[PDB]
Design an enzyme around this catalytic site. Structure first.
Site, PDB file in Angstrom:
ATOM      1  N   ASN A   9     -38.690 -56.742   9.134  1.00 60.75           N
ATOM      2  CA  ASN A   9     -38.839 -55.406   8.721  1.00 60.75           C
ATOM      3  C   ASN A   9     -39.191 -54.558   9.904  1.00 60.75           C
ATOM      4  O   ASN A   9     -40.241 -54.498  10.644  1.00 60.75           O
ATOM      5  CB  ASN A   9     -39.956 -55.001   7.783  1.00 60.75           C
ATOM      6  CG  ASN A   9     -40.174 -53.694   7.455  1.00 60.75           C
ATOM      7  OD1 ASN A   9     -39.128 -52.872   7.683  1.00 60.75           O
ATOM      8  ND2 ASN A   9     -41.183 -53.250   6.923  1.00 60.75           N
ATOM      9  N   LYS A  11     -39.118 -51.570  10.336  1.00 59.12           N
ATOM     10  CA  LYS A  11     -39.759 -50.316   9.981  1.00 59.12           C
ATOM     11  C   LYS A  11     -38.987 -48.951  10.619  1.00 59.12           C
ATOM     12  O   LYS A  11     -37.892 -49.202  10.636  1.00 59.12           O
ATOM     13  CB  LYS A  11     -41.097 -50.296  10.436  1.00 59.12           C
ATOM     14  CG  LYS A  11     -41.879 -51.491   9.903  1.00 59.12           C
ATOM     15  CD  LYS A  11     -43.491 -51.430  10.064  1.00 59.12           C
ATOM     16  CE  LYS A  11     -44.102 -52.453   9.397  1.00 59.12           C
ATOM     17  NZ  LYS A  11     -45.772 -52.508   9.518  1.00 59.12           N
ATOM     18  N   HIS A  94     -43.647 -51.028  -0.137  1.00 55.91           N
ATOM     19  CA  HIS A  94     -44.201 -51.356   1.179  1.00 55.91           C
ATOM     20  C   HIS A  94     -45.533 -50.299   1.369  1.00 55.91           C
ATOM     21  O   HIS A  94     -45.579 -49.263   1.011  1.00 55.91           O
ATOM     22  CB  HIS A  94     -43.537 -51.081   2.445  1.00 55.91           C
ATOM     23  CG  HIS A  94     -44.048 -51.636   3.682  1.00 55.91           C
ATOM     24  ND1 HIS A  94     -44.697 -50.997   4.490  1.00 55.91           N
ATOM     25  CD2 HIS A  94     -43.783 -52.898   4.174  1.00 55.91           C
ATOM     26  CE1 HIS A  94     -45.367 -51.867   5.489  1.00 55.91           C
ATOM     27  NE2 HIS A  94     -44.550 -52.982   5.265  1.00 55.91           N
ATOM     28  N   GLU A  96     -46.834 -48.855   3.488  1.00 59.20           N
ATOM     29  CA  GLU A  96     -46.553 -47.559   4.341  1.00 59.20           C
ATOM     30  C   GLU A  96     -46.101 -46.567   3.359  1.00 59.20           C
ATOM     31  O   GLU A  96     -46.359 -45.269   3.408  1.00 59.20           O
ATOM     32  CB  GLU A  96     -45.618 -47.677   5.555  1.00 59.20           C
ATOM     33  CG  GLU A  96     -46.643 -48.569   6.512  1.00 59.20           C
ATOM     34  CD  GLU A  96     -45.829 -49.197   7.537  1.00 59.20           C
ATOM     35  OE1 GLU A  96     -44.498 -48.923   7.331  1.00 59.20           O
ATOM     36  OE2 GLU A  96     -46.201 -50.003   8.488  1.00 59.20           O
ATOM     37  N   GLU A 166     -49.196 -57.890   1.116  1.00 60.20           N
ATOM     38  CA  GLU A 166     -49.833 -57.211   2.353  1.00 60.20           C
ATOM     39  C   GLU A 166     -51.199 -57.155   2.263  1.00 60.20           C
ATOM     40  O   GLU A 166     -51.895 -56.608   1.364  1.00 60.20           O
ATOM     41  CB  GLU A 166     -49.238 -55.906   2.486  1.00 60.20           C
ATOM     42  CG  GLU A 166     -47.920 -55.779   2.528  1.00 60.20           C
ATOM     43  CD  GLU A 166     -47.278 -54.391   2.537  1.00 60.20           C
ATOM     44  OE1 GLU A 166     -47.200 -53.799   3.873  1.00 60.20           O
ATOM     45  OE2 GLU A 166     -46.836 -53.786   1.695  1.00 60.20           O
ATOM     46  N   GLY A 172     -55.278 -51.505   9.902  1.00 60.47           N
ATOM     47  CA  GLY A 172     -55.864 -50.396  10.451  1.00 60.47           C
ATOM     48  C   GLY A 172     -57.233 -50.266   9.975  1.00 60.47           C
ATOM     49  O   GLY A 172     -57.922 -48.957   9.514  1.00 60.47           O
ATOM     50  N   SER A 212     -50.019 -59.507   9.591  1.00 55.60           N
ATOM     51  CA  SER A 212     -49.653 -59.653  10.795  1.00 55.60           C
ATOM     52  C   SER A 212     -49.294 -61.205  10.998  1.00 55.60           C
ATOM     53  O   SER A 212     -49.921 -62.283  11.394  1.00 55.60           O
ATOM     54  CB  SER A 212     -50.904 -59.367  12.042  1.00 55.60           C
ATOM     55  OG  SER A 212     -50.235 -59.560  13.252  1.00 55.60           O
TER      56      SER A 212
END
Ligand code: NA
Ligand code: NA
Lengths: 251, 251
Positions: A9, A11, A94, A96, A166, A172, A212
């Protein structure tokens, strides 16, 4: 035996079509070891060049699609448009987009239904946030997401479904995920599938780790029994991507 | 004298790259009369073919862009990507994105700021909904939108700004807009600019009508003193588009 699956990905990267073409040329020269299904997801505006130039033994993917074939939806890209280029895959759900772009589960279920009913294969993303992780309610939260997903999958289309977990609680947040965490949640997902839709489907569906993934942890993660591959973020823009694709030999 | 401006917004159309190329060939043969600036906005995934094949005296536009140059924004397309193809325009704030995709004014101000600071020209959309229209509060509502916009425009970049008024109160509501309505709201916008940022800027900025524009009403609308052109929806996919571009001779 489920074929190991690695989705790269990109992104919202890279910044220029020139950087995209250089990246493709890099991927085209990579020596893949073992047995692995490789998909590369890129920004809409780079999809045509990707479809045209990327090695034919890998497949191109969108990073999102809308819910309708076409119409008064300024700014949106639709399944027919993507397919008209010969593109067979899209990422959906996703974190995000769920977070930044405010996509809810009903929006996402509708997308999965429309995509699959229209000949596309999906990488469907789920995962719990920090609060549910800390409350020890990860499995409950993830189950709800999968349950909202399941009714969208048309009969005979589970072969076209890949699920990515995920660890949003580790994105974060100041918390990191262990190899054991990845394995545990991939297993959680598989058990949810087995309970809800049967062992035959649960044994066939690839479940990916979408946290990650880097050259320094891909081998260890690959060996986890319920981890069938990865949806890779940053590393998919780097030479380390091939190490990740080749981690399959440890699965 | 403000150059008449006609933007063709394909929205999420057409369904296939083949239909897009046929549409382009049609536009390439169109005989433009008078003095008019023509821009064509298409889905991201069709932008490369558009930029490559569209007549060079017209310009290509995105239908949206994100707020950042690149990064962890799965599904988004950014200004640098678009520019890397030689594309200079983007639509922002279209009612369909404000409504369906939940884009708020702060999101939109940020986009306008980033786009303009990065060498792009914008078609910035505004317009009031049915309730404000019926309350006779259209000018108040539209003023608030423009005020949220103004601080995003960098000094010396108003030449790169075009504003489109969408009568959202007349879109999917059971109400229709008259020619007089269009003129009145375009004037409202211009007066807001004059009051807030000065007459020199107000006299230069093109203000477009973004309601239903067709071959049967483009001439009448074009003649309205404060209407500097159109952001066209459905007709931009049809041969009638050239009639709309040519309406400029009545302005
Ligand atoms: Na494994
Ligand atoms: Na006029």
């Amino acid at each position: 035996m489920r074929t190991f699956f690695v989705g790269g990905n990109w992104k919202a990267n890279p910044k220029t079509v020139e950087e995209a073409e250089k990246l493709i040329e890099m991927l085209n020269g990579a020596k893949v070891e073992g047995n692995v299904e490789v998909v590369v997801a890129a920004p809409f505006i780079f999809l045509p060049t990707l479809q045209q130039k990327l090695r034919k033994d890998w497949k191109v993917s969108a990073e999102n699609v809308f819910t309708k074939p076409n119409g008064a939806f300024t700014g949106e890209v639709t399944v027919p448009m993507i397919k008209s280029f010969g593109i067979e895959w899209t990422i959906l759900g996703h974190s995000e987009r769920r977070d930044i772009l405010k996509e809810d589960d009903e929006f996402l279920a509708a997308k999965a239904k429309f995509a699959l009913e229209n000949g596309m294969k999906i990488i469907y993303c789920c995962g719990e946030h920090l609060s549910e992780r800390e409350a020890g309610k990860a499995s409950e939260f993830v189950s709800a997401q999968i349950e909202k997903m399941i009714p969208a999958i048309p009969a005979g289309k589970w072969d076209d479904v890949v699920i990515a977990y995920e660890p949003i609680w580790a994105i974060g947040t100041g918390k990191v995920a262990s190899t054991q965490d990845a394995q545990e949640m991939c297993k959680v997902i598989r058990d949810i599938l087995a309970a809800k839709v049967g062992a035959d489907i649960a044994n066939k569906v690839r479940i990916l780790y979408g946290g990650s993934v880097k050259p320094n942890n891909c081998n260890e993660l690959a060996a986890c029994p319920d981890v069938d591959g990865f949806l890779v973020g940053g590393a998919s823009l780097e030479p380390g991507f091939i190490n990740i694709v080749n981690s399959n030999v440890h699965s």
